[PDB]
Amino acid sequence: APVRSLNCTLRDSQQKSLVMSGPYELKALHLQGQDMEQQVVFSMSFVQGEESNDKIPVALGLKEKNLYLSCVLKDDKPTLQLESVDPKNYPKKKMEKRFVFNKIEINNKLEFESAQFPNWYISTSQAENMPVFLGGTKGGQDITDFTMQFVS
Ligand SMILES: CC(=O)NCCc1ccc(S(N)(=O)=O)cc1
Protein backbone atom coordinates (compact mmCIF):
# COMPACT_ATOMS: atom_id res chain seq x y z
CA ALA A 1 0.00 0.00 0.00
CA PRO A 2 1.10 3.65 0.16
CA VAL A 3 3.61 4.97 2.70
CA ARG A 4 2.09 6.40 5.87
CA SER A 5 2.98 10.00 6.85
CA LEU A 6 2.15 12.41 9.70
CA ASN A 7 2.29 16.20 9.63
CA CYS A 8 4.34 17.59 12.49
CA THR A 9 6.64 20.28 13.79
CA LEU A 10 9.85 19.72 15.79
CA ARG A 11 11.34 21.85 18.62
CA ASP A 12 14.80 21.30 20.21
CA SER A 13 14.96 20.60 23.96
CA GLN A 14 15.72 24.31 24.57
CA GLN A 15 12.33 24.89 22.81
CA LYS A 16 13.79 26.47 19.65
CA SER A 17 11.53 26.19 16.55
CA LEU A 18 12.85 25.33 13.04
CA VAL A 19 12.45 27.73 10.07
CA MET A 20 13.83 27.96 6.49
CA SER A 21 17.28 29.62 6.09
CA GLY A 22 17.26 30.06 2.31
CA PRO A 23 16.23 27.19 0.00
CA TYR A 24 18.35 24.24 1.30
CA GLU A 25 18.96 25.00 4.97
CA LEU A 26 16.95 25.12 8.21
CA LYS A 27 17.80 27.28 11.23
CA ALA A 28 16.63 27.14 14.88
CA LEU A 29 15.38 30.08 16.84
CA HIS A 30 13.21 30.98 19.78
CA LEU A 31 9.69 31.73 18.35
CA GLN A 32 6.34 32.53 19.97
CA GLY A 33 3.14 34.27 18.84
CA GLN A 34 2.39 35.34 15.24
CA ASP A 35 5.95 34.44 14.03
CA MET A 36 5.14 30.71 14.79
CA GLU A 37 3.53 30.53 11.27
CA GLN A 38 7.19 30.71 10.03
CA GLN A 39 7.89 27.10 11.31
CA VAL A 40 8.36 24.18 8.81
CA VAL A 41 5.73 21.36 8.92
CA PHE A 42 7.42 17.97 8.38
CA SER A 43 5.68 15.18 6.58
CA MET A 44 7.27 12.38 8.65
CA SER A 45 7.09 9.15 6.59
CA PHE A 46 7.39 5.72 8.29
CA VAL A 47 9.83 3.93 6.01
CA GLN A 48 11.56 0.58 5.48
CA GLY A 49 14.47 -0.15 7.80
CA GLU A 50 15.70 -1.92 10.98
CA GLU A 51 13.15 -1.15 13.77
CA SER A 52 12.71 -1.76 17.55
CA ASN A 53 10.20 -0.54 20.17
CA ASP A 54 11.94 2.81 20.65
CA LYS A 55 13.93 3.12 17.32
CA ILE A 56 11.66 3.81 14.26
CA PRO A 57 13.02 4.58 10.74
CA VAL A 58 11.50 7.78 9.26
CA ALA A 59 12.07 10.21 6.44
CA LEU A 60 11.69 13.93 7.21
CA GLY A 61 10.12 15.33 4.04
CA LEU A 62 8.68 18.89 4.14
CA LYS A 63 4.84 18.70 3.94
CA GLU A 64 3.47 19.67 0.44
CA LYS A 65 7.08 20.19 -0.94
CA ASN A 66 9.38 17.71 -2.80
CA LEU A 67 12.26 18.31 -0.30
CA TYR A 68 13.80 15.84 2.20
CA LEU A 69 16.42 16.07 4.87
CA SER A 70 19.33 13.88 3.78
CA CYS A 71 22.76 12.86 5.11
CA VAL A 72 25.67 12.91 2.65
CA LEU A 73 29.42 13.37 2.77
CA LYS A 74 30.38 16.96 1.89
CA ASP A 75 34.11 17.88 1.70
CA ASP A 76 34.60 14.42 3.40
CA LYS A 77 32.27 15.10 6.39
CA PRO A 78 28.74 13.71 7.16
CA THR A 79 26.43 16.72 6.67
CA LEU A 80 22.70 17.47 6.73
CA GLN A 81 21.26 18.85 3.48
CA LEU A 82 17.80 19.56 2.06
CA GLU A 83 17.64 17.51 -1.14
CA SER A 84 15.03 17.89 -3.95
CA VAL A 85 13.43 14.75 -5.42
CA ASP A 86 11.10 13.87 -8.30
CA PRO A 87 7.66 14.71 -6.85
CA LYS A 88 6.13 11.84 -8.89
CA ASN A 89 8.13 9.18 -6.97
CA TYR A 90 8.07 10.50 -3.33
CA PRO A 91 7.29 9.80 -0.66
CA LYS A 92 7.84 6.06 -0.90
CA LYS A 93 8.11 3.23 1.62
CA LYS A 94 11.68 2.21 0.45
CA MET A 95 13.43 5.59 0.85
CA GLU A 96 17.17 5.67 -0.04
CA LYS A 97 19.43 5.37 3.05
CA ARG A 98 20.65 9.02 2.95
CA PHE A 99 16.98 10.07 3.68
CA VAL A 100 16.46 7.70 6.65
CA PHE A 101 16.66 8.73 10.31
CA ASN A 102 16.22 6.45 13.25
CA LYS A 103 13.71 8.30 15.47
CA ILE A 104 14.75 7.21 18.99
CA GLU A 105 12.50 7.89 22.02
CA ILE A 106 14.49 8.32 25.34
CA ASN A 107 13.05 9.95 28.51
CA ASN A 108 10.10 11.64 26.71
CA LYS A 109 12.47 13.24 24.11
CA LEU A 110 13.26 12.27 20.49
CA GLU A 111 16.61 11.99 18.81
CA PHE A 112 17.05 11.57 15.05
CA GLU A 113 20.11 9.44 14.23
CA SER A 114 21.30 9.21 10.61
CA ALA A 115 20.63 5.59 9.35
CA GLN A 116 23.57 6.24 6.90
CA PHE A 117 26.05 7.61 9.53
CA PRO A 118 25.67 5.79 12.90
CA ASN A 119 25.88 8.06 15.99
CA TRP A 120 25.44 11.24 13.91
CA TYR A 121 22.32 13.17 14.93
CA ILE A 122 20.16 16.05 13.78
CA SER A 123 21.58 18.87 15.98
CA THR A 124 21.05 22.51 16.84
CA SER A 125 23.36 25.09 18.39
CA GLN A 126 22.65 26.83 21.72
CA ALA A 127 22.95 30.22 19.86
CA GLU A 128 19.88 31.61 18.04
CA ASN A 129 19.56 31.69 14.20
CA MET A 130 22.24 29.05 13.43
CA PRO A 131 21.88 26.15 10.95
CA VAL A 132 20.36 22.81 11.80
CA PHE A 133 23.22 20.36 11.18
CA LEU A 134 24.41 16.78 11.54
CA GLY A 135 26.56 16.40 14.68
CA GLY A 136 28.79 13.43 15.55
CA THR A 137 27.78 13.05 19.23
CA LYS A 138 24.48 12.88 21.25
CA GLY A 139 26.89 14.37 23.90
CA GLY A 140 28.31 17.90 24.63
CA GLN A 141 27.19 21.58 24.09
CA ASP A 142 25.09 21.02 20.93
CA ILE A 143 21.42 19.94 21.24
CA THR A 144 20.37 16.48 19.90
CA ASP A 145 16.98 16.09 21.67
CA PHE A 146 13.62 17.26 20.30
CA THR A 147 9.91 17.18 20.88
CA MET A 148 7.31 16.64 18.12
CA GLN A 149 3.97 18.54 17.86
CA PHE A 150 1.22 17.03 15.69
CA VAL A 151 -0.30 19.32 12.99
CA SER A 152 -3.79 18.89 11.33
C1 LIG B 1 -2.49 21.33 7.93
C2 LIG B 1 -1.47 22.36 8.32
O3 LIG B 1 -1.42 22.87 9.45
N4 LIG B 1 -0.56 22.72 7.32
C5 LIG B 1 0.49 23.71 7.59
C6 LIG B 1 0.78 24.57 6.36
C7 LIG B 1 2.20 24.41 6.01
C8 LIG B 1 3.18 25.01 6.79
C9 LIG B 1 4.52 24.84 6.46
C10 LIG B 1 4.90 24.08 5.34
S11 LIG B 1 6.47 23.88 4.91
N12 LIG B 1 6.63 22.29 4.77
O13 LIG B 1 6.66 24.44 3.62
O14 LIG B 1 7.27 24.34 5.97
C15 LIG B 1 3.90 23.51 4.58
C16 LIG B 1 2.57 23.65 4.91
Question: Could you tell me the distance, in angstroms and rounded to a whole number, from the CA of residue 51 to the centre of ligand 1?
Answer: 28
**Resolution of this structure in Å:** 1.5
83 CA to middle of ligand 1, Å? 18
Alpha-carbon separation of residue 78 from 15, 110, 131 (angstroms): 25, 20, 15
Going by C-alpha positions, the residue among 70, 27, 62 that lies closest to residue 45 is 62
Domains of the chain: 1-152 (2.80.10.50)
What was the experiment behind these coordinates?
X-ray
71 bridge partner residues: 80
CA–CA dist 52, 61 (Å, integer): 22
